[model samples]
Target: SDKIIHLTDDSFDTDVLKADGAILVDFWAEWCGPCKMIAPILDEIADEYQGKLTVAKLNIDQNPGTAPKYGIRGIPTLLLFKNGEVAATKVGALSKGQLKEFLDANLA
Candidate 1:
């Protein structure tokens, strides 16, 4: 179950930055190969960490301002936002297990 949310620069601050919990925003694009590979993994993580985090995607192609604002230099960027701030940012794709472990590290 790839339960993910769609986000835009318009609602970014409110939906993620100022949110009450954690948010894993995947900065991706339609044509990027690595970005597509990580989608399903992200979705599975979203389902597993339902209440612990909010998983969403932002296509860099479609969202020009948002990705650059965060200085996204590569595809498959995972931005972790918590407590109204950016907790961490990772570039490149990760496996389901590694993603889970990464989240676990940040979560605690």
Candidate 2:
């Protein structure tokens, strides 16, 4: 879904780092089973939080340079960026319910 934008090394700087508002980027990999688990949740989240939040996914393998720059040592890394800065960092798979709280807490 375009709602959940697919980011690559090329577009990351503009699409995420320089984005207008709060954007949640999923740093994941193809080999990760946990990453697959959260895909649908994130897709739903993209629809649910459309105007309030921006959602994107970046393959860690495809976009290797970006992940390490952010000090990502794990797969399924979720980084919430607000106005070009990393506001929050969650390093694991989380349920959709808890994710709402996370977004609400930070976006507030």
Candidate 3:
């Protein structure tokens, strides 16, 4: 399973922006209830989309710099990046089906 990668501020641009494939980045924090709620779904999606997409997790508390750059005003912000550009943004917890549908529609 290519579970979500933990990215730090120093590796954000290089690992996320400069990546070759589509990336699904979740901006979350440990204390956020909603963020915790979505963790398992994210992990499942990460495994499901293993080869086709890259799933990543960035801790807002640890990487405050990049979070602000992306205008992340809230926790559990999910950003889908394709070709180095943001293709979609979803805020808050999402069910497995909802996540799959969103990825299929946007990353298809």
Q: Considering only N, C-alpha and C atoms within 3 Å, which residue pairs clash in candidate 2?
A: none
Off by over 4 Å in 1: none
Clashing pairs in 1: none
lDDT of 3 at 48: 87
- Tens digits of lDDT, candidate 1, 21-46: 78889988899998888888888898
How many angstroms is residue 73 displaced in model 3 relative to the true structure, after the best TM-score fit? Answer: 2.4
TM-score of 2: 0.94
Residue 63, candidate 1: Cα error in Å is 0.7
Query: What TM-score would each prediction reach against the true structure?
Result: 0.93, 0.94, 0.93
- In model 3, the worst 10-residue window by lDDT is 1-10
Q: What is the lDDT of residue 20 in candidate 1?
A: 77
Q: Which structure is stronger by lDDT: 1 or 3?
A: 1
Backbone clashes in model 3: 0
The C-alpha stretches of model 3 lying farther than 4 A from their native spots are: none
